[PDB]
Amino acid sequence: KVFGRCELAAAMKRHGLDNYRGYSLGNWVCAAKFESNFNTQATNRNTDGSTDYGILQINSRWWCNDGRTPGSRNLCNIPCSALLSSDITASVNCAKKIVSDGNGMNAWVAWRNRCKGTDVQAWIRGCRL
């Protein structure tokens, strides 16, 4: 499923991501835009052999099991395919665990490079939240 901007913002708010660990809703929308282009089916292979899955591009190195990243962890206790569902519950819950880990949203390379220090509020402008 490819979400619309305001549709995703609303789903993320509903799931309690708005101001989670002090990160405003715009930060999460911005990150999802640049990580996956709002596409729940997005997948990308990393150089170490691990893969990123879903709207928030969650890594099989640490967070999920994709059956092909030998020696990795499954900290969110999920198959990586759960991250590709049209329902974002699994992605959101795993993202909450990631952002609490100690580095905050710096865990997301695209957020650090493209969202951090910018006017992220613009990503929720015009939306009926």
Respond yes or no: is residue 87 known to be catalytic. Answer: no
b or e along 59-72 (b: 16 or more beta carbons within 10 Å of the residue's beta carbon)?
bbbbbbbbeebeeb
Please identify, in words, the CATH class of the domain defined by 1-129: mainly alpha
Respond yes or no: is residue 52 known to be catalytic. Answer: yes
Helix (H) or strand (E) holding 10: helix 5-14
The residues with which 23 forms a beta bridge, in sequence order, are: 20
Cα gap 69→85, rounded to integer Å: 21
> Which amino acid is located at 25 in the chain?
L
Considering the candidates 48, 52, 66, 87, report the single residue annotated as catalytic: 52
Binding site per annotation, positions for substrate: 101
Long-range contacts of 34-40 (CB under 8 A, 24+ apart): 34/110, 34/111, 34/114, 34/115, 35/108, 35/110, 35/111, 37/2, 38/2, 38/3, 38/4, 38/5, 38/8, 39/1, 39/2, 39/3, 40/1, 40/2, 40/3, 40/84, 40/85, 40/86, 40/88, 40/91
Considering the candidates 35, 48, 87, 119, report the single residue annotated as catalytic: 35
Resolution in A: 2.0
Domain edges within the chain: 1-129
- Provide the token pair at 107: 């865990």
Determine contact, residues 69/60, Cβ cutoff 8 Å: yes
Determine contact, residues 81/60, Cβ cutoff 8 Å: no
